[PDB]
Design a binder for this molecule. Structure first.
Ligand SMILES: Nc1nc2c(ncn2[C@@H]2O[C@H](COP(=O)(O)OP(=O)(O)OP(=O)(O)O)[C@@H](O)[C@H]2O)c(=O)[nH]1
Ligand SMILES: Nc1nc2c(ncn2[C@@H]2O[C@H](COP(=O)(O)OP(=O)(O)OP(=O)(O)O)[C@@H](O)[C@H]2O)c(=O)[nH]1
Ligand SMILES: Nc1nc2c(ncn2[C@@H]2O[C@H](COP(=O)(O)OP(=O)(O)O)[C@@H](O)[C@H]2O)c(=O)[nH]1
Ligand SMILES: Nc1nc2c(ncn2[C@@H]2O[C@H](COP(=O)(O)OP(=O)(O)O)[C@@H](O)[C@H]2O)c(=O)[nH]1
Ligand SMILES: [Mg+2]
Ligand SMILES: [Mg+2]
Lengths: 431, 48, 117, 433, 426, 434
C-alpha cells in the first residue's frame, strides 16, 4: 500500500542500484530467476512495495535504469542479478555524456526525458497508493548530474504531493575523479536545494575509511562500497515493509528532521559493522550499537560533526530489543554532549524500532543526521568553483552549448546563501 | 556467509578474458534488446 | 591544485609520513574562508589576465632548481644556536641569509632556526 | 556499438597501423585470414560480413606504393579490405605545398568517399583517430586538408590526433621546421586534442629500460600500439569505472589553443627485470610522473601541470589508486597551476595487456597510461620557432614552397600565429595576486 | 561498578604491563584463550573491575597499549598471553622518540594523543562508576616519560575528580641506562607533582638486590623483575575484587597516606618472598610477614628508610588471619622505634585485610610507605641535572625542538622546592 | 616496518657492502639466488623486500665511479640477488681528487643516485635512516659523498644519516693527497651529518695479527669484522631482546655538542678457535676487553683523553645483572676517566641472538659478544696530526693545481683549515673540567 519507485541515473547509479536490488532480493528471498524461495511467511506480506507480480508467480523490481552510453548497461545485464529487470525498464541513448553537465542537461539529455517519464508514468500509475520516489546518482558526472536533476525537476512538477529521496555521491575532497567536479557539483546542488525533499550525501573517502578502519578488508573493490550504500538504503525503508514496535516511514522521518525547507542534507551511518578479525572481542548490546552510530569516524561523509551542531538526528533500529535501553541511550548521548546539539530544540533524536533484523544478524541500526557541519562540503565546492571560474578555466565546453554565464553566478550565489543560512542557524542562541 | 557488508569475495581473482558483448542496441530505429542469445562476459552463458 | 583541502576527520590517514613520503610537504588548508556573492571575472577568454588585475613577479614556469643551479655550499637543514658563541652563530645565520634563492625554490631547503647563542 | 574509425596517414601512420592491427587481432582472437577459430567485443573495430569475415574500420592513406604494397603482399593481405588501402602515384617529397595544394587534391575525394562508406555502416560513432607525423610531406600537407574537410563534413565528432613531434636533437629532414609550423597553424583551429610522441624519447626509453642497444622503428610502433590499446580498452572491455572517448577530450583541454598533452606508459620493462621488480599499483604511477619515463623529450619539473588523465588496466583495486595519488599529491617536486584545484581523472579496466609473440615487453598483471597536459611544452614551441625563423631569416628553401601553389605571406602569418601561441602559454602560466 | 583502566606507555610499560595481565588472569582462572577455567564461584563475583565481558563467555582486559614504535608491541603479541588484548587497543606510531623528552612530549607524541584519547574515552564511558586510572612507565625514556606525562595532563583535565595512579620506574644511582637520563627524569617529576594522586617509585637496582640476597636467583632475567612489580600492582587493589574482614580501596589508602597534596611518593614492598633452599627453614606466622615487610632490604625503591622518618605507612594483608595479631604487630613496631616515626601523627600505620590469598600460598602482605627519606631520590637527580645544565650539555637536542630554556629552570625550582617540603617534616 | 637504507659509496664501500650482505643473507637464511629454501617470518623486512614471487631484493645502493669494482659483483656469486639498477657505475674515476669527485664527475650521476634513493625510500613503510659506508681518503668516497649528503639533506629533512668512515691511519697511507681530501671532506661534513663511526685499517691490522693469529691479513678479514660490527648495531632492530636500542637513540646519546659527532667503534671478543677452547667468555671479560687501549679499532690511545659518552650493545646469552655489576666495576676504576659534566655516562642495549658463524671465516663460535661506540676527547690529537700534515703540504702550495683547475677556487683550502683549527679549540674547550 506504499509503493516505492526506483530511479537509477548514470553508471554510478546503475552499479549502486544493481547492488541494491541484489541486497533486497536476498532480504525477501527472491532467486535470480524471479520466483520465491523463502522460509518465513512474513517475507510475502509487504512485497508489493518493491516488486510487481507477473503471470507465473514472478516478482519484478519497480526500478528504471536511465543512462546514455549502454556500456555500463551491458555490464549490469552481464551480472548475477541482471536477468530480473524488465527489458522495457532499460533506457539509453546512443551518445556519451562525456563528463559535461551541459551535454547531460541541455543537448543530449533533452530528447531522452520524454521516454523516461513515459516509463515512470507507466510504473507509477500501476501502484495502488504510491509513497514516493527514490533516486541513486553522483554529483561528479555527466548523466547522473546532468539528466538526474532534469528528471527530478520533471517528475516533481508532475507529482507535487509526493516525496523525493536522493542518494547522491558528492565530490571527494582528495580523490578528484573528474577535473570538472566543482562545475558539475555546483550546478547540480543549485537544483537539488530547490527540488529535493531529502538528500543523503554519501562520500567515497568515508566509505574507504570505514571499509579499512572498521571492516578491515584488504582489497575493497566497488562491490563492497555499493554493499555499504545498499545496506543504508535497506535500513532506511525497513519499517515500511516489516512490522515493529514503533514504526516510522520516510515521510515521518522527513517531518522530524527537516525544520526549514532549505535544510535537507543528511549524513548517513550504519551500526553493526564488525571487523573480520575482531568479533569475539565485542558484545552485541544496544549501548554498543549507539557508541558506533554516534562515532565521528563512522559517518559516510567527509565532514566532521565536531565542527558544527547537530540540528536533528534519526535512529532506526532493527531487531527484538527493549525500549527502555534505547530511550535511555539516546537521552544519555544527548545529555553528555551539550556542545554538539542546538539548544533551541529539545529532544533532537527520533527513534524507530523494527522487529525483523537483517539476515545473519541479530540487531541493527541506521543513523541519519541533519548537522550544521555539512556547510564544509558546500564551502569547499564553492571555493574550488570560484578558483576555476575567476580564470575562465574549462568554460568553453559549457558556454558553447547554449549556457549563459549568469547561470554559474546564480548557482554560486544560491550556494553562498545556503551556507550563510547554515552559519546563522549554528550561531543562533536560545534567548 | 549470508551477504553482509564485507562478506563478499572477488569473482575476478584468477579470471582472464574480461570481454563484453553488445546486448543493448538499436534496430529499425527502435531501442531494443538486440539478441537475447549472447554470452555473459568471457564466453560464459548468461545463467540459463 | 595550488590548494590541498583537509579531510577534517580523516586527515590523519592522509598525512605525508603515513603515505610513505618522507620528504617535506606542501601545506594543508586547515581553515576555509567563506565568501558572499558571485565572483567578478578577472581573466580573458584565452586565459589572459585583464590589464587592471595586479600580477605576481615570480617565474611563470616554476622555481625548480636543478643540480647545476643549486649553490655550491648548501646550508644545513638542522640549525640550533644553543651552545654556539655570539659570533660563531652569527656566521651561521649569514650563511643561510646569503642565498635567498635556495630558500624560495619549489625544492626549497628551509632551515628552521631555534635558540639563542 | 561504441566504435571508432582509424585514419592512418603517411608512412609513419601506415607502419603504426600495422603494429596496431596485429595487436588488435591478437586481443580479439582474429586469425590473419580474418575469421574467428558468441563474443562481439570486436564490433568496436572489426565489422562482420555475411561470409563470416571480419574487416577493420581503418583507412590507410599514402601517396607512394612502396609502403602499401608491403601490406598488400605480406601476412595480413587477406584481412584488409581492398579499398581501405588508398595509394597515390607520386609522393609529396617532403613538401607541405605538394602535400596540400597539388598532390593532395587528387585522392581526397576517394578518401572522403571511403570514410563516408565506413561511417554509414557505423551505427553509433565515437570518433576518428588520426595517426600522422609532423615532419613528413604527406603526413602534414595531406593531413591538414583532411582534418579541414572532416571538420566541414562531420560537425562535432571527436577527432583525436596521434602525432610524431620533431625530436629536439635527432632529426631526419631539413625542412622539418617549415612543415611543422605550417601544419600546427591549421591543426590548432581544426583539432580537438593532439597526443604526441617523438622518436628520441622512445629511443632513450627502449635503451635504458628494455636494454636494447640498437632499436628499430618496429619497437617504437609496438610501444605506440600499446598506448592506443590502453586508450580504447575502456570501450572494449569492462571495468570498475571506464572512460569514453569524449571524457579525456573534455578533461584535458582547458582552452581552445591548448590541446597538446604528453603520453606516458608504465611499466615498460623486460622479462629479465620483471623477475626482480615488484610492480604494484603505487610504483607504476610513481614511474609515470618520472621525467626519465616520459615519451616527449622534455622536463616537466620546469613547468606546471594543467590536467592529468590516468588509465589503469588489470589487477587493480581503487584504494591503491587513491593512496598512490595522494602520495603524488603530497610531493613538492610536482607543481600544478593555480586555477586547477581538481586536476585528475581516473579510469580503471579489468583486462591486463596482451603480449605479442616476437615482441620485447614482458607481460604483466597491471599497467597504467598517463595523458598529461602541462606548461613545459613552451620549450618545444620556442625551440622550434627559433629553428624556423633562423632558417627563414634569409629565405632558405622558400622557392620550393612558393612555386607549388602557396603565397609567401603564409609563412609570416604562421610565424605570427605561433608567436601568439607562446604568449598564450606564458599568460596562462602567470599567477594572479 | 568500580572499574580500573590500565594505561601502558613505553617499552618499559609494555613489558611490565604484559606480565601484570599474566598474573591476574591466573588469579581469576583465565586461560590464554580468554575464557574461564576455575574452581571457585567467588572468582567471578568482581571480575568487571579489570575485564570486559564479550560474547561466548570471553573476558578481555580494559588496557590500552601506547608506544611510538611497534618493536616491543610485536614481542608482547607473540608471547603466551598475547591473544587476550583487543586488537583495536594497540596505538602505535612509526618513528621512535630516541630517549628524547622534547620529541615524545611536543613533536612526535603530539600527533599520537589524537588516537589514544579516542580509545580512553571509549573504555572509560563503558564503565558503570569509574574508580580511577592506572599508568606504568619509566622516567628515563622518551615514550614513558615524554608522552606518558602528556597523557596524564590530558586525562586529568577531562576527569578531574578521579584517582590517578602511576607505577613509575625512576632512574637508578649507578646503573644509568641512558646518557640523557636526568633531563627526562627531572622534567617528568616536575609534571608528576601537580597532576598525580599517588605515585609508586620503583627502581631496577632494588629489584636486583631482592633477586640476589632474598630470592637467591643465579640468572634473574627481566621476566622475574616484572613479576615482582606485578605482585604489588595486584596487592593494592585486592580489596576491590575480594571480600574481607576489613577492606580498603584505592581511595581509602590515598586519604590515609597523604597529609599534604605535594607529598605522594611511596615505596613499595611484597612480603612472603623466600629462596628455594630456605623454604623449609621458615615458619608461616603474621610476625614472619611483618618482619620481612618492614625490612630495609625489601623496599622496591633505592631509598633507605633508616635515614628518614615514616610519615604514613600502609599494609594490605591477604589470607584468613586473626585481627588481634594484625593489630598487635603494627603497634609493637611503633612503640620500640620512636625515632623513625613522626610525632605529630599518632598511629601512622593503616591496616587492611583480605580473605583470598594468592594461589599456592597461605598468606601475603603489600607495603606502601610514605617516608621523608624519599628526598634522597630527588636530591641525587637534582645534583646531576645541575651538573649537566651549567655546562649546557645535550640542550641542542631539547632546545632545537622548540622547548624554552626557562622550562629547565622551572623544573629545577619545582623539584628543589619539593626537597624542602620534605626536609621540614624530618 | 623498521626499515633502513644502506648506501655503499667507493671501492671500500662496495667491498664492505659485499662482506655485509653475505652475512645478512646467512643470518636470514636467504640463498644467493634470492629465495628462502622452503619456509611466515617477516623479520627480514629491515633489510630485504618481498617480491610477490618469493624473491628478496636488498635495500642497498652501490655507487662507484669506476666499472671494475662493480663488475665483480655483477659477475660474482651474488649476481642474481641484487637488482640491476641498484649497482650504479661511473665511467672514469675521480682519481684521488676532491674537486673531481665534487664538481665535475660527481655532479653527473648524483641525480640518478637520488632517484634510486627516492624509489627505495618510497618503498620503505617506516624509515629509521640511511647508513653511508665510505672512506675519507678516496676521491669518490670523499668528494661524491660530500654532495650526496648535501643534496640528501636538501631532499629529506632531518632523517638520520649514520656514517661508517674509514679514517686515515696515522702511519699507513695508500695515497698522498689524503690529508687534502680528509680536510675538504670533514669541513663540509660537519654541518650535514648526524653521527660518524670511524674505523681505520692499521688498528684492525694489529688486532687481526695479535688476537686472531693471522700473520698476513687481507681486506677480506677487515671487511668481515666491519660487517660483524654493523650486524651488532642492527640486531636490536632485527631480533628481539630484553631492552633494545633504536637507530635514533645513540644518535642522541653520543653527540653532546653541534660540532662533535665522531665516536669510535670497538668489538669484543675477537678471538680465534684455538683460544676460545681455553678462555671462558663471561659478561665481565668482554666489557673489560672493550675498554683496553690495544683492543680499540682506531689507532688512538684514550688514556690521553676523557670519555664523553659510551654506548654498549650486548648480544647472546647475557643477563642484565652481570652487565650492571661489570659496568659498576668499570666505573670504580681510576684509569678510565669521564668528564665532570657527564655523571650518567653509559647507554646499554641487550639482544638475544648470538653472532652467526660464516664458513671460511676466522672468528670462533661464541655465545655472547659486545660492541661499543665511545666518544672521547683523545681524537683531538688525531685532528692535530692531520692538520700538521695538511699545513706541511700546504705551505708550499703543493698538489693545489690538481684541485684548482678542476672546479674549486683556492680560498676553500684556507677556509677549511680555519674550520678545522676552530674545531681543535672546540675540542679543548669541551675537554676542560670546571
Ligand atoms: N615513431 C615513428 N616515426 C616514423 C615511423 N616511420 C616514419 N616516421 C617518421 O616520419 C618522418 C618522415 O616522414 P614519413 O612518414 O616517412 O613520410 P611522409 O609522412 O609520407 O612524407 P613524404 O615521404 O614526403 O610523403 C620521419 O621524421 C620519422 O620520424 C615509424 O615507424 N615510427
Ligand atoms: N677497511 C677497508 N678500507 C679500504 C678497503 N678498500 C679500500 N680501502 C681504503 O680506501 C682508501 C682509498 O680509497 P678507495 O676506497 O680505494 O677508492 P675510492 O674511495 O673509490 O676513491 P677513488 O679511487 O679516487 O675513486 C685506501 O686508503 C684504503 O685504506 C677495504 O676493503 N677495507
Ligand atoms: N560508490 C560508488 N561510486 C562510484 C561507482 N562508480 C563510479 N562511482 C563514482 O562516480 C564518480 C564519477 O561519476 P560518473 O561515472 O562520471 O557519473 P556519470 O557521468 O553520470 O556516469 C566518481 O567519483 C566515482 O567515484 C560505484 O560503483 N560505486
Ligand atoms: N623494571 C623494569 N625496567 C625496565 C624494563 N625494561 C626496561 N627497563 C628500564 O627502563 C629504562 C629505560 O626505559 P626506556 O626503554 O627508555 O623506556 P621508553 O623510552 O619509554 O621506551 C632502563 O633504565 C631500563 O632499566 C622492564 O621490563 N622492567
Ligand atoms: Mg613515403
Ligand atoms: Mg676508486
Amino acid at each position: 500500500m506504499r509503493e516505492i519507485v526506483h530511479l537509477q541515473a548514470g553508471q554510478c547509479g546503475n552499479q549502486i542500484g544493481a547492488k541494491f536490488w541484489e541486497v533486497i532480493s536476498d532480504e525477501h528471498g527472491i532467486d535470480p530467476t524471479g520466483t520465491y524461495h523463502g522460509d518465513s511467511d512474513l517475507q510475502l506480506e509487504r512485497i508489493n512495495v518493491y516488486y510487481n507480480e507477473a503471470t507465473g508467480g514472478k516478482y519484478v523490481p519497480r526500478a528504471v535504469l536511465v543512462d546514455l552510453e549502454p556500456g555500463t548497461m551491458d555490464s549490469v545485464r552481464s551480472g548475477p542479478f541482471g536477468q530480473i529487470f524488465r527489458p522495457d525498464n532499460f533506457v539509453f541513448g546512443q551518445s556519451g555524456a562525456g563528463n559535461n553537465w551541459a551535454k547531460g542537461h541541455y543537448t543530449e539529455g533533452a530528447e531522452l526525458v520524454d521516454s523516461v517519464l513515459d516509463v515512470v508514468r507507466k510504473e507509477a500509475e500501476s501502484c495502488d497508493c504510491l509513497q514516493g520516489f527514490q533516486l541513486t546518482h553522483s554529483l561528479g558526472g555527466g548523466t547522473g548530474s546532468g539528466m538526474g536533476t532534469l528528471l527530478i525537476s520533471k517528475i516533481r512538477e508532475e507529482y507535487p504531493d509526493r516525496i523525493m529521496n536522493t542518494f547522491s555521491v558528492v565530490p571527494s575532497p582528495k580523490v578528484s575523479d573528474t577535473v570538472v567536479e566543482p562545475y558539475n557539483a555546483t550546478l547540480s546542488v543549485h537544483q537539488l536545494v530547490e527540488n529535493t525533499d531529502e538528500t543523503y550525501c554519501i562520500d567515497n573517502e568515508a566509505l574507504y575509511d570505514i571499509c579499512f578502519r572498521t571492516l578491515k578488508l584488504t582489497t575493497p573493490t566497488y562491490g563492497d562500497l555499493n554493499h555499504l550504500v545498499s545496506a543504508t538504503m535497506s535500513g532506511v525503508t525497513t519499517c515500511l515493509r516489516f512490522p515493529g514496535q514503533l514504526n516510522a516511514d520516510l515521510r515521518k522521518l522527513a517531518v522530524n528532521m527537516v525544520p526549514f525547507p532549505r535544510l535537507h542534507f543528511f549524513m548517513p551511518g550504519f551500526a553493526p559493522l564488525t571487523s573480520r578479525g575482531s568479533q569475539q572481542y565485542r558484545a552485541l548490546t544496544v549501548p554498543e550499537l549507539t557508541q558506533q552510530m554516534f562515532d565521528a569516524k563512522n559517518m559516510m561523509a567527509a565532514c566532521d560533526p565536531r565542527h558544527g551542531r547537530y540540528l536533528t538526528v534519526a535512529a532506526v533500529f532493527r531487531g527484538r530489543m527493549s525500549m527502555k535501553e534505547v530511550d535511555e541511550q539516546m537521552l544519555n548521548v544527548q545529555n553528555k554532549n551539550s556542545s554538539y546539539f542546538v539548544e533551541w530544540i529539545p529532544n533532537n533524536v527520533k527513534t524507530a524500532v523494527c522487529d525483523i533484523p537483517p539476515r545473519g544478524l541479530k540487531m541493527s541500526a541506521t543513523f541519519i543526521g541533519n548537522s550544521t557541519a555539512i556547510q564544509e562540503l558546500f564551502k569547499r565546492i564553492s571555493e574550488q568553483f570560484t578558483a576555476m571560474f575567476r580564470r575562465k578555466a574549462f568554460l568553453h565546453w559549457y558556454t558553447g552549448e547554449g549556457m549563459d554565464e549568469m547561470e554559474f553566478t546564480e548557482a554560486e550565489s544560491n550556494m553562498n546563501d545556503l551556507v550563510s543560512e547554515y552559519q546563522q542557524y549554528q550561531d543562533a542562541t536560545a534567548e | 556467509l549470508p551477504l553482509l557488508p564485507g562478506n563478499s569475495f572477488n569473482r575476478n581473482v584468477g579470471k582472464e578474458k574480461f570481454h563484453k558483448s553488445q546486448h543493448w542496441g538499436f534496430c529499425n530505429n527502435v531501442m531494443m534488446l538486440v539478441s537475447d542469445e549472447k554470452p555473459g562476459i568471457g564466453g560464459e552463458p548468461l545463467l540459463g | 591544485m595550488a590548494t590541498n583541502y583537509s579531510a577534517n576527520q580523516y586527515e590523519k590517514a592522509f598525512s605525508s609520513k603515513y603515505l610513505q613520503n618522507w620528504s617535506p610537504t606542501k601545506p594543508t588548508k586547515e581553515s576555509i574562508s567563506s565568501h558572499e556573492g558571485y565572483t567578478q571575472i578577472i581573466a580573458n577568454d584565452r586565459g589572459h589576465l585583464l590589464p587592471s588585475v595586479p600580477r605576481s613577479k615570480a617565474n611563470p614556469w616554476g622555481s625548480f632548481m636543478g643540480t647545476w643551479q643549486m649553490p655550491l655550499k648548501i646550508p644545513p637543514a638542522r640549525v640550533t644556536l644553543t651552545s654556539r658563541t655570539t659570533a660563531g652563530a652569527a656566521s651561521l645565520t649569514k650563511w643561510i641569509q646569503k642565498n635567498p634563492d635556495l630558500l624560495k625554490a619549489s625544492n626549497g631547503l628551509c632551515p628552521e632556526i631555534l635558540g639563542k647563542p | 556499438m561504441r566504435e571508432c574509425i582509424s585514419i592512418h596517414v603517411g608512412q609513419a601512420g601506415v607502419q603504426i597501423g600495422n603494429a596496431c592491427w596485429e595487436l588488435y587481432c591478437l586481443e580479439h582472437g582474429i586469425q590473419p585470414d580474418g575469421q574467428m577459430p558468441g563474443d562481439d567485443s570486436f564490433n568496436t573495430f572489426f565489422s562482420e560480413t555475411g561470409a563470416g569475415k571480419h574487416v577493420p574500420r581503418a583507412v590507410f592513406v599514402d601517396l607512394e606504393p612502396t609502403v602499401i604494397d608491403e601490406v598488400r603482399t605480406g601476412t595480413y593481405r587477406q584481412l584488409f579490405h581492398p579499398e581501405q588501402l588508398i595509394t597515390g602515384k607520386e609522393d609529396a617529397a617532403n613538401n607541405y605545398a605538394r602535400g596540400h595544394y597539388t598532390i593532395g587534391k587528387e585522392i581526397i575525394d576517394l578518401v572522403l568517399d571511403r570514410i563516408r562508406k565506413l561511417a554509414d555502416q557505423c551505427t553509433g560513432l565515437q570518433g576518428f583517430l588520426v595517426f600522422h607525423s609532423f615532419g613528413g610531406g604527406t603526413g602534414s600537407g595531406f593531413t591538414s586538408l583532411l582534418m579541414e574537410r572532416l571538420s566541414v563534413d562531420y560537425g562535432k565528432k571527436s577527432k583525436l590526433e596521434f602525432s610524431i613531434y620533431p625530436a629536439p636533437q635527432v632529426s631526419t629532414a631539413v625542412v622539418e621546421p617549415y612543415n611543422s609550423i605550417l601544419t600546427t597553424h591549421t591543426t590548432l583551429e581544426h583539432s580537438d586534442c593532439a597526443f604526441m610522441v617523438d622518436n628520441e624519447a622512445i629511443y632513450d626509453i627502449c635503451r635504458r629500460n628494455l636494454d636494447i642497444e640498437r632499436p628499430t622503428y618496429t619497437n617504437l610502433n609496438r610501444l605506440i600500439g600499446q598506448i592506443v590499446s590502453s586508450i580504447t580498452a575502456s570501450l572494449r572491455f569492462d571495468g570498475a569505472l571506464n572512460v569514453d572517448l569524449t571524457e579525456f577530450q573534455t578533461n584535458l583541454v582547458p582552452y581552445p589553443r591548448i590541446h597538446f598533452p604528453l603520453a606516458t606508459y608504465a611499466p615498460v620493462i623486460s622479462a629479465e627485470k620483471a623477475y626482480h621488480e615488484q610492480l604494484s599499483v603505487a610504483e607504476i604511477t610513481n614511474a609515470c610522473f618520472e621525467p626519465a619515463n616520459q615519451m616527449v623529450k622534455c622536463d616537466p619539473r620546469h613547468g606546471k601541470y594543467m590536467a592529468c588523465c590516468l588509465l589503469y588496466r588489470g589487477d587493480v583495486v581503487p584504494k591503491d589508486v587513491n593512496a598512490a595519488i595522494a602520495t603524488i599529491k603530497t610531493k613538492r617536486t610536482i607543481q600544478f597551476v593555480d586555477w586547477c584545484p581538481t586536476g585528475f581523472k581516473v579510469g580503471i579496466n579489468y583486462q591486463p595487456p596482451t603480449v605479442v609473440p616476437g615482441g620485447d615487453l614482458a607481460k604483466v598483471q597491471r599497467a597504467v597510461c598517463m595523458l598529461s597536459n602541462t606548461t613545459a611544452i613552451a620549450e618545444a614551441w620556442a625551440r622550434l620557432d627559433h629553428k624556423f625563423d633562423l632558417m627563414y631569416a634569409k629565405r632558405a628553401f622558400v622557392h620550393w614552397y612558393v612555386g607549388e601553389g602557396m603565397e609567401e605571406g603564409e609563412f609570416s602569418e604562421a610565424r605570427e600565429d605561433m608567436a601568439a601561441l607562446e604568449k598564450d602559454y606564458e599568460e596562462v602560466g602567470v599567477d594572479s595576486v
